[PDB]
Amino acid sequence: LKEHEVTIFVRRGGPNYQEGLRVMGEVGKTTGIPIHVFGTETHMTAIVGMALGHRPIP
């Protein structure tokens, strides 16, 4: 997948949504396949709005 040039966009909510953000934030840090983590402060389908480059990524 490092041969295949991937980018992960994640948007999430639920029970332990914040520490779910924590734990998958540190694993997206530990192996370096890039994960864009997003919580509930964004719109739900905004991350495919910025995944196709139609709006910026904070």
Q: Measured between alpha carbons, how far is 50 from 39 in angstroms, rounded to an integer?
A: 14
- Which of 8, 19, 34, 44 contacts its own copies by CB under 8 A? 19
Give the residue among 50, 48, 52, 47 at the shortest CA–CA distance from 37.
47
Tell me how many residues contact its own copies (CB under 8 A).
Answer: 8
The helix or strand, by DSSP H or E, that contains position 48, with its residue range, turns out to be helix 47-51
Q: Which two tokens stand for residue 49?
A: 């709005």
55 binds its own copies (CB under 8 A): no
- Which of 3, 5, 26, 41 contacts its own copies by CB under 8 A? 26
Detail the residues annotated as belonging to a binding site for citrate: 12
Residues near its own copies (CB under 8 A): 16, 18-19, 22, 25-26, 29-30
